[model samples]
Target: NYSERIPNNVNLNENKTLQRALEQWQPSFLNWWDDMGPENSSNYDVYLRTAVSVDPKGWADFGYVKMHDYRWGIFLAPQEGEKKITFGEHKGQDVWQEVPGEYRSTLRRIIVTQGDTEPASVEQQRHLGLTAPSLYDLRNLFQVNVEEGRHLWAMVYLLHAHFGRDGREEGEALLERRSGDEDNPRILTAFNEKTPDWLSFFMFTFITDRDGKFQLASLAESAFDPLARTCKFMLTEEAHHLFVGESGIARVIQRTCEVMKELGTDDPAKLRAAGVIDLPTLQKYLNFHYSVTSDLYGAEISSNAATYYTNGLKGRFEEEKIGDDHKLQNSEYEVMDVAGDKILTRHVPALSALNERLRDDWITDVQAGVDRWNRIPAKFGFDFRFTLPHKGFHRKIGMFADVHVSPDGRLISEAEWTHQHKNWLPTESDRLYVHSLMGRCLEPGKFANWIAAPARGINNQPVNFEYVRFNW
Candidate 1:
C-alpha cells in the first residue's frame, strides 16, 4: 500500500477516480511543502515516524527519512463494529459513510476548517528548525511538521472522498491560504500567529494543539464514520504533539531551574541576562496561546456549535461517557460573561452553551498540565508557578470579546490595560530577548543554552544519537 501513488490504507487503488484526484493534489502539496515547509530542511535526514497502518500495533515505523521523501497518506481508523450515531438528533441512526444531501454543506465547512489548520501550523513553524535547540529538538520539529502534513492528507481525503467538487476546491484552497497572509489567511485566528521561537512553538503545541485534541475528540464522535475514524487516528498522532509541547516547556523550565540554582538568584533581569527564559515570560506566552486557543471553540453560547451537535455532525468531548441522555433536549450550563462591571457566570440552554462546556473540559485538562509544570519549580525550590490566565483575558471571541479582563478575572479599564499589558503579555523586549537565544545547536549531544536536553531520546535512542544528520 505504501507503494501506491498516494499511500493510503483506504484502498485508494480500487477507486481510480479518488486515487487520481489525490494524485493530482499530491503535486500541489509538494509544491507548497517546498515553498513553505520547514525552512532549508529538505536536506536533513531527520529521525521521524511515518504511519504505516491504522491498527494500534502498526502505529509507526521509525527511520532516518529526508523531509521530501515522507510518505504522506490517507489513513482512517477501522470502522467500529455496527457503528451508529451516538448523539444529536441522529442518535441511533446508522453512521454516515457517504455525505447526506441535507447535511452536506455544514459537514464540508467543518472538515475544511479543520483541514486548513494542518498546513497553517507547518507554515507557522517553518523557520523553527533553523534555530533549533538541538538535533533532537530539530528532529522533533520535523516530526511535528511532517505529521501535520499527513493530517492535511487526512482532511483532504475527506474533502475529496465525500464533498465532491466543492470539497476539491476546499482541498486546493487549503494549500493556497498562507498562514499570516492578509489577503488569503488561514481560517482560524491562532493559525495566523507566528511560532517565531521555540518557546512560542512549545506553548503553541501545548495550548493550541491541545485545542486540536479537544476538537478532534469531538469530531471523533462524528455521525459521519469516515470523519470520526480519521480524527480517531489523528488523535493518536496528536498525543505526541501534546507531549512535545508539555515536555518541551518542561525541559525549558528544567534548564531555567538548573540555571537558577547555579546562580542562586530568581530575578527576571538576572535570569534573562543568563540567557534562560524567566518563569513570568513563560506565563505571558501561556496566556497569549491559551486565550487565542479558547477562541477556536467559538462563542460561549454558539448557535453554530449547538447546531453541529444537534444535527449529528459533531459531539462533545467523549460523548458516550457522559451520563446524560445523548440528546441534550433539556439541560442548563453556566457560561462566564461580564455582568455590569463584574465578570460572572449565568445559565444558558445546554445546547447553545456547548462551546463553553467544551472549553471547560479543555480548561480542566490544561490546568492539570499547568499543575504538573508547577512540580518542576517546586523540585528546584523555586516558588514560581505558571498559571493559565483567566479565559476572559485576551480573548478575541466569545461573550468576553467586548470587554477587557485581567488575568486574575477582573474587569479592567482600557487605559489600565494599555499601561499594564506588558506585564501580563510578551512585550517586544521579551520577544527580542528570547529571539537572541535562538541559536542553532546542531552538535550531537549539546542543547542550546535556553533549553535543557530531554530526559531520553525518541524511541529508546540515546540522547547523543544523531537525530538529524545534515546532508550538506
Candidate 2:
C-alpha cells in the first residue's frame, strides 16, 4: 500500500471512489508542478529525500531523482485507539472519526486554509533554483519544493476523503489561486508576499516556515483524528525546512564575517563591492520577514480563535503542557495594548487572547534561533547583532496596524517613521544590490561569493558531491 498508485497507508486503493478521484486529479497536480514547482529544474537529477513511511526516525530514503519526477504522496501518522478530545468544551469526549455535521464547514475551512499555504510557498519560491548558490543549495531547494508538493497532497487527501464532492472542488481551487496574483490571490497575506531572492527565501524559511511549525503543532492537537495525524507527520518534514533557513543564513553570515576580517572593514559599500551581504542588510530582511510572518496569527483578540479552541477545531501550542485547566474558562492572559503614548499590558480572557498567546510563544521560539545566529558574529569578534523588531513595529495586522513604531518598539510620529523606515527595512536599492550578486553557480564544489558552503553535505555525501546532475 505504501508503494501503490497513490502511495498511501490509509487503504487508499480499497476506497475505490477516493482513489479514482485522486488519480483523476493527480495529472493536474503534476501540471502545476511542471509550471510552478521549480523553474527549469525538471531536467536535473537532484539528490533529494522522499518519505517512505511515517516513522519519525527512518521515514526518508535519499536518491538522485528528477525534480519533476519526485513522488508526491499522502502519508499520515498512524492513528491512536479511541483517542479522546483533550481540551476545549468537548473535553473527555471521544474524538470524532468523521467531521461533525454542525462543524463540517468550519473544519473544511481550516483544512483548506492550511492546504493553501503549501502550494503558495512553491509558487513564491519557484524561480530560486535558477540562481542557486551551489549544487548543495540547489538540491535542498528541490527537496523543500517536492515535500511541499506532498503536503498539498496530504491536505487534498483529507479533503477528498472527508468533505466529499465539495472537497474535490476546493482541492482544484487550491491549484488555481496563484500566489501574489492581483486577480486571484492566495488566502493568507504572507503567502502572497514575494520571495524574490535567496536571502528573502532563507529568511522566509527561517521566520515564515517557523510560523508554519507553530500553526501545524497547534493543528496536530485537533480533535478531528485525521487532521491531527496529517499535521503530526507534516511537522516531521517541517524540521528540515527550518534547518535550511537557519543554517543557510548562518553560513551566509559566516562568509560575510570571514570577508569582513580579511578586508578589515564592515562598511556597506566595501562589503557590497566585495560581494558579501553586510550585517545591516541582513537585519533589514529579518525585520521585514519576521513582522510579515507575525501577522499570520491574526488579531490579538480574536473571537474566531476562541471559537476554534472552544469547539475543538484547533488547540493552542503545546496545549497540554501548561499548568492550568485546559478549558481556559476562567483564565486571563496578558496582552500588549497601545496606550496614550506607550505600549502597556492588560489581562484579557485567555480564550480571546489565544492568538496573542500563540504569537508570543512563537516569539519565544524564534528568539532562540536569533540567539544562535547572533553567536556567529560574536565568535568572529564582530560587534554587530541581529534583534527581532518590536512586536508593535511594522505590523500590518493586529493591534499596531495603524501605528508607526520604531524597531526598538517606540511609538513615533508618522514623520519620524516615514523618514527613517528604510534604515529598518530593505529598500529598493538594497534589493537590487542583492539581486546584482545573484548569479547561477552550478559547478560542483563551487559556491557564489555571497554564501559559504554548508559545513558538510546532504545524506552524508561530500560537499562537492554532484547534488544536482545538470543536463545543461
Candidate 3:
C-alpha cells in the first residue's frame, strides 16, 4: 500500500477506479504545492519528522526531506470492523462502511469544508519562509506547510474514495481555490487572513491551528469510517504545529518580559525604543488573532453545529471521557449573547452551541499556554498577563459580530469601542513596529532581540547545534 504514488493502507491498487481518479488529481495537487507552498524552499533540506508507521511508539523519525518531496499520502489508522456509532441519533449502531444514502450530501459538505481549510493554511503561510527568524524556525515553517499539504491529501483521499465523481471534482477544486484571492478565496475566513510576521505566525498556529486540532478531533469521531480514520493520523502531525505555536509565543513573551525587567518600563514606546515588543503590543496582536480565530468556529449558537452533531458527523472534545449520553439530547450548555450593557450567558441546547462549546474548551486550553507566558513575567516580578480579549471584542462572525466588548468582557458603546480599540488591538503604528523588527537572525543560539532562544533544542540537540546551515 505504501509503495503506490498515492500511498495508503486501504489497498488503493485493488480499486483501479479510485486510483485512476486520484492519480488524475495528483498533478493538480502538485501544481498547487509548487505555486503556493513555502517560497524558494524546494531545494532546502529541512530536518523534518516523517511518519514511518502507525505504531504507537517511534512513529515519527527525523530526517532531511526537501519540502517539495514529502510523501503526501492517504494513511489511516488501522480499522475496527465491529465499531459502532458512539453518539447522536445513530448511537450504538454499526458505523457506516459506506456513506449512508441519507447522509450523502451532508457528509460531502463536511469533507469539502474540512478540505478547504487544509490548503487555505498553506496559502496564508506561503510567504512566511521569506521572513523566517532562524533556519530552525524556517525548517519548522516548512514542516508545517508540507504537513498541511499532506493533510489536504488526507481530505482529498476521502473525497475521492467515498464521494465518487462529485467528490472527485471537489477534490480538484480543493487545489484550485486560493487563500485570500479575490477571485477564489479559501473556504474559511481564518485561512484567508495573512500570517505576515512570526508573531502573527505564532498566533495563527496557536489559535487557528488549534481550531484545526479540535475540529479534526471532533471529525475523528465521525461514523463515516474513512473520514474518521484519516483525521486520526492527521491529528498526530497537528500536535507539533500547536506546540510550535504555543512555545513560540511563550518564548516571545519570555524575551519581552526580560526586556521589561532590564528597561524598567511597561510602555510600548519604551519597549519599541529598546527594539523589543512591549506587552501591550503583544496584547494587541493577541486580541486580533484571538478574535479572528474565534470566528473560525462559526456562530456561537449555530443550526449548522447542531445538525453536524445530531447527524453523527462531529463530536465533542474527549467525547467519551466527559460523560453525558455521549449524546447531548436535552442537555444545555452556557452561551453568550449581548444583553443591555453586558455579555450575558444563557442556556442553549448543547448540540446547537457545539461551536461555542468547542471554542470554550479551546479558550481554556489556550489560557494554559498564556499562563506559562505570564510566569515568565511573574518570575521577572512584572505584574503582567497576556489575556484573550472578550469573545465579542473584534469578531466578524457569530453573536459577538454585532457587539462591542473589551478584553475584560465588558460591553461598550461604539464611541467607547472606537476610543479604546487602539489601546486594545493593534494600531497601524503597532504593526509597523513589529514589521521593523523582522530582520533575520541566523547565528546559532543567537536570537533576535525581540525573541528568546528556546530552553533546549530540537530533538534534544544542543543549544548551539546548527538546526539549519546555508552552506550544507
The candidate scoring highest on lDDT is 2
Tell me the number of clashing residue pairs for each predicted model. 0, 0, 0
Regions of candidate 2 where Cα sits further than 4 Å from its true position: 1-4
User: Across residues 99-157, which tens digit of lDDT does each residue of candidate 3 receive?
Assistant: 98888999898889988998888888888777777767777787788788888888888
lDDT ranking from best to worst?
2, 1, 3
**Full-model lDDT, candidate 1:** 0.89
Ranking by TM-score: 2, 1, 3
Q: Model 1: per-residue lDDT, tens digit, 1-472?
A: 2323777778989998988888888888998999999998778788899998888876789998888889898888987788899999889999989989989999998899898999999999998988988988888889999999999999999999999898899888999999999899998878888888999999888888998999999999999999999999999999999999999999999999999999999898999889999888988888888888888988888888888999998899989899998888898888876789987778888999998889999999999999999999999777889887888999888778878989998899999899988998899989999999999899999989999889899899999999999878
lDDT (0 to 1) per candidate = 0.89, 0.91, 0.82
Residue-wise lDDT of candidate 2 within 156-218, one digit each (tens)? Answer: 999999998899999999999999998999999899988999999899999898989999999
In order of appearance, the predictions have TM-scores of 0.98, 0.98, 0.95
Q: Summing lDDT over every window of 10 consecutive residues in candidate 1, give the lowest-scoring window.
A: 1-10
Count backbone clashes in candidate 2.
0
TM accuracy, model 2: 0.98
Clashing pairs in 3: none
